[PDB]
């Protein structure tokens, strides 16, 4: 591991990651997390030739509001559906640059998606 070298373990280990487009208000809500830093759950439900992916905030973040206080029922945490997209026509890899200047290939993007507002 010398200066200027790119650590390759990740890529050749074929470690996979997801690349997701997230609405600004949702990522802003994620910033309000505390403790362990949990924000919610990612759900993947498969039926016959059909897959539904979504993200739902946890109880803590579902109850922190902006100037408004939410309206009707205050029901249950809202499901944010994912719109799955293709990655086949391109090779996307992730590389990190640490505070110590170390560069490393962490993994390959195996799935792309866009998280839609609820």
């Amino acid at each position: 591991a010398e200066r200027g070298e790119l650590d390759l373990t990740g890529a050749k280990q074929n470690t996979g990651v997801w690349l997701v487009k997230v609405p600004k208000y949702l990522s802003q809500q994620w910033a309000k997390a505390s403790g362990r830093g949990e924000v919610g759950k990612l759900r993947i439900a498969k039926t016959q030739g059909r897959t539904e992916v979504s993200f739902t905030l946890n109880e803590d973040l579902a109850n922190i509001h902006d100037i408004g206080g939410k309206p009707a029922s205050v029901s249950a945490p809202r499901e944010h559906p994912f719109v799955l997209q293709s990655v086949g026509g391109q090779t996307l890899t992730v590389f990190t640059e640490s505070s110590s200047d170390k560069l490393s290939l962490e993994g390959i993007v195996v799935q792309r998606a866009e998280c839609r507002p609820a």
Partner: protein, 139 residues
């Protein structure tokens, strides 16, 4: 909806603690990049433009001053927007130049979701997105 379904669920954490910045390194399918062939690689900022001079333009009737005056400038060096140079497998291997993608923001941004040992996903914002192509395509 469906009477039966197979479900997988994951806790998601979004760390604030991160001594690492996550970036995207993208290759065009046409260049057929295969990591199995990578034995070693270097990734360094290309500072070649640092010492490259460019001509910048600086009473008479305007229609009498067709010939403008020029000087030369040594631009402000922002190591951040300098391209990356990726060199694979020594001096005889492939070389790519990395250029930052700039169709900048709207009301969304990209995150990388990576799985952790405990099974949860951790999401990190993408810092920068680079398109990498063979050095030979650059002039």
């Amino acid at each position: 909806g469906p009477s039966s379904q197979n479900v997988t669920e994951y806790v998601v954490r979004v760390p604030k603690n991160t001594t690492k910045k996550y970036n995207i390194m993208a290759f065009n399918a046409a260049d057929k990049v295969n990591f199995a062939t990578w034995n070693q690689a270097r990734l360094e900022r290309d500072l070649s433009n640092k010492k490259i001079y460019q001509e910048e333009e600086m009473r008479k009737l305007r229609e009498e001053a067709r010939r403008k005056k020029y000087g030369i400038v040594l631009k402000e060096f922002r190591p951040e927007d300098q391209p990356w140079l990726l060199r694979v497998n020594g001096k005889s291997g492939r070389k790519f130049k990395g250029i930052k993608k700039g169709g900048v923001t709207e009301n969304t941004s990209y995150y990388i979701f990576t799985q952790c040992p405990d099974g949860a996903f951790e999401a990190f914002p993408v810092h920068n997105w680079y398109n990498f192509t063979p050095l030979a395509r650059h002039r």
